[PDB]
Symmetry: D3
Subunit: 250 residues, 6 copies
């Protein structure tokens, strides 16, 4: 293989220059399923790669795994194989009371609560999305009548203390993150996830285009018994949006 | 006056909720002249305010002064007066060799090389522009046929060592900023200016919309004798763009 | 003109090597008025420059605008024109209960809550005043019987959250600055202003002499209806002191 | 399931309180095969868990994924399931010229070049291994006659720029990490990997025991063509060591 | 003398390569007294050096003074004279309720709340002890039946605010250290002392072996009238342990 | 004793409120010999205290030890005993080529290269000397005809890598401090020593007066064989200056 981890040789890619990069292989398969001729290319550790075709152009779909470090390997190796545009879709807990479960969020830029972004640019650099990608995602969302919010996302290297969860083995949060959630809420941050600050920073600092969209599965500000059926629909909607945005970027 | 520095009452604004915020009064008057029924409201220190009408709605134009600190007083006091949308227009030196004098930059987010942004959000929070405002500026640029780049800007608390200039009384640059220019170049940063990291961060973190456009009057990467008429024309082009974008945000 | 912003050509200066640098042009005119042959030299953006003569030697007076960034341009360009000594006068809110309105404060060194100082020296370097300048200011204050306090000042890039004001559009202060005021009070800081950390650091790090004096117009620790007449007298007193100190430095 | 990601109930663990946590499932299965009555419990995303018996006690083996973020979810959720001892086994590139391929490293503590460790303890807290676990790994290494080094490891959120690799799409490394490798070399750091600063810090700071051993598959300081069989044998040796050490901690 | 401060010429040392480095000369004399042929070599400022012999090999004992700076001079100059292994013994206040007065603590690594460690390695590097030294100290403690705890220690440049003591001239603690003690307790830190972060970091970063042991004289978590007699016994026990560990390292 | 380390009761001080704080006891005795009725009060560890009379008022002279940590214990415990004014005298290596051996430095404020100052005030707070004390030291210097420089000093937690010395066991300096000396040189820093950033910050932030003077015994910028008699004479000159300044502060 032409790269170290993903097990992909460049002609495998058939000249593709856009990849969709969700977190896990299950969703890779769902996204491939909305395009033509889906074929599984490789599966090695957390990286599962499919190829498909969209309006006659090849598109790659490749799982990142959880967190910026594995995200950074996937984006780096796809770039080594010629990918220049990256779009992430995920699911997310919102932290604003006006955002509802089933809404869609388009991330303009992220609060860098990760470690990998710093390996690309010092903290003062913005983890900002590419304007074309963001545009395609906002337009795509409107093409299926999604309720959309466009704004900042907080991107944490942890699922638990970095998102100020206390339902843990220790039940406490280190001082730097204690009270962080309410600061991010006051500053209008939409939601937490775990990979965007790494994704956006490494692309924006290296001449790659990236954008990021997510469906809301939980609203942290209001207790509510999760509805598995709403979640599955929300996921399906966010997948269509990412594909439709790719269509507009090809 | 209803505010501490601006010498403005809310009554003066006649219900305006959008401000164009250039740096200097000469530019204030130039922007207002493009619009209908422009009148000077006040001038105290570096803050000069005019009111004008655009498609029949009142709009404020108010100078920030140089740098994040006076910017931060203008923005806060206009917000206190009911402004919720802020558009900055500037003129700038580009640091990328593909960007020419006369091109227009629209800033998606800024490298925080200032101090005042930290008084609003820790450094990990992105200095990012509002999506609607960036969309309107990009559309306005296209509508006059401008050659446009959309991207990251470095926003410095100094004109000289923070922009890595050596043509100074000291002729040197402190260690932290020595070599910085080449780093930002490698990371695709378009240009330097001195107020956007303050404006964008304090707006993004307080639920105010902001965008920023600039005309290129210099290219730091190419020696060339400045053309005083080219610069005037580029200023004209940027001013028209910012008025057109405001038209789309009213 | 010999410099980029101030619009000054060096022979304009007539060999001067000392400048007084207050914030705004109104006060430039007041300070020029206490010396011989005052003549206005230039006015461009927030920088208004006069020249006058004191015991037969030329002195420049030049407004800085609000905040370290514009302060840094003025000091830099005056230095390029041969100024080697800089004295600032301003007005200030004190934060200690033993300091009264109408007292005068002489700043030995400043807490660096600004951004521009870092473009001259890393944060560990002290924003300290020059000993001769400080001496001339303390002696000058005593020559008109002023009640004087000599000590540390906190120098903020913002007027509002950085000075822990809550009477704002957001009515909140970011976590790093929330509770900061009471820390500075406990540590004996006299007052807040907005330019000294930039002024003192850039001069002390570049072989220039600077000093800083201010009249107290407000005491933050005790509510009190401002008396416009006390303020005007205090200002006039602080202007005489700065001039008289310059006399001792020439 | 009793946890959010792992798909495990406490019942599944049959009272296990020690986990071996390698990076990938292939290694999970290889570790479990060394022990008695191994059975697969669950596989979701990058987390694959088997149970097995060692000297008649249940032991869990569960993959972390690449990087501190997914590591941090595995460790937290196993802790929630009653795991109190964690042993990591990895394979690694050494950066010291006295360390050969096939040698074993046991890590006393790690250089924190990751983000997730900060979500547990500020950077001044040591990423240090539990003494009993390090003792058991050193004893286990000696018991198979391994050539062992005991020392500090650098733990990076990236495989590429944080390990100072230039064979990349950008071919460059941000200023902070340029030259870093030589610094760590001078300071005696044995090797790079990507999860130990997270694992050790979050265990050391929450009263969980952790240790870490790795087999050397590369020496970055010596060009040499990789031998695919040497690497397999080194992986075998490291796996045996980690099982033997677990034997001593049960 | 061969060095700048300690007043020692290398042949004085008779080929020794291990030094015990307690804080003060009184204890130097106590430690020398447990070995053969103790002879005082020098006394200059806080550095008092004796030589003695242990199983026929020369050992040096040299006081460090209080705090990392003087500790850093002593270790540096002994290293210039050929010492390669350093063992510190001291006395300490514990901050955990399960540790009793008269227990012994062996430090695996330290929280860096000092300044000197940074002059050897950036903060992310662990202030970790050498594994052999730590082993010899744990084994030595067990050889006299000591109640031992092995773990992390917090190493402060101050005795008072850095250890969160309020019984002071100011009776307050600066914000960064206010509430620090309870964070360190939650994270399982055993005790405070003042030299280990400097000692461990400078040795671990420069190929020197160091270890650190201490007897508990106070337990901060429970008020208790100090018993001078328990303290003296505890000291005598900790001295025997350090000597006995040296025996195992020679 | 009324304090924990110094072995002093308040009674011992006979109402003294000024201390001269040199580094070592030999200098303690030398200072006291200049004054009337000097008597040794106590000696424990690096702290040796004498009392003496100056113009009929009791004055304390007490050694700090090397470095901010032991300095910080001396200053705190003398403050507890009623000392409110502290004057340090040292001997130092200059780093500017205009400063000669035998010159006297008076420090207006210090570059904080230590750890203990942070335990009193964050790094943005200036390590600045009290104006009265600096005035008295400058006056005392002039009164004996000393060649004096008044300015910034760099205060390091180490004698070796923090002063950028390479004549060491490692012969190297960590990245952060490599090149630092030249930076401080460019920024006009006069000299290095090891206690002033601690002393000045902790005094300035707690309402205690402090000043600092030093005699130059080396010029790092000029190779020259040290003259043992020149150094003794320079020490004499500095001691006389500090006693004269104390005379003016009583
Ligand atoms: K992962
Ligand atoms: K300004
Ligand atoms: K000491």
């Amino acid at each position: 293989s032409d790269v170290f981890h993903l097990g992909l040789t460049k002609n495998d890619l058939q000249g593709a220059t856009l990849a969709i990069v969700p977190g896990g292989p299950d969703r890779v398969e769902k996204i491939a399923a909305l395009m033509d001729k889906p074929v599984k290319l490789a599966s090695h550790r957390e990286f599962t790669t499919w190829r498909a075709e969209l309006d006659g152009k090849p598109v790659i779909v490749c799982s990142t795994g959880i967190g910026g470090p594995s995200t950074s390997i996937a984006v780096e190796e796809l770039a080594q194989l010629g990918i220049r545009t990256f779009l992430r879709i995920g699911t997310t807990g919102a932290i604003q009371p006006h955002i509802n479960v089933g809404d869609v969020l388009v991330t303009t830029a992220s609060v860098r609560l990760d470690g990998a972004s710093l390996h690309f640019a010092p903290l003062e650099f913005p983890a900002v999305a590419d304007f074309e990608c963001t545009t395609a995602l906002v337009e795509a969302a409107k093409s299926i009548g999604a309720t959309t919010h466009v704004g900042v996302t907080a991107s944490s290297d942890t699922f638990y203390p970095g998102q100020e969860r206390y339902d843990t083995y220790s039940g406490r949060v280190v001082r730097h993150f204690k009270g962080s959630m309410e600061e991010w809420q006051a500053m209008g941050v939409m939601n937490y996830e775990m990979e965007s600050a790494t994704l956006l920073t490494m692309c924006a600092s290296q001449g790659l285009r990236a954008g990021m969209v997510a469906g809301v599965i939980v609203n942290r500000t209001q207790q509510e018994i999760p509805n598995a059926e709403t979640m599955k629909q929300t996921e399906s909607h966010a997948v269509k949006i990412v594909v439709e945005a790719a269509r507009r970027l090809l």
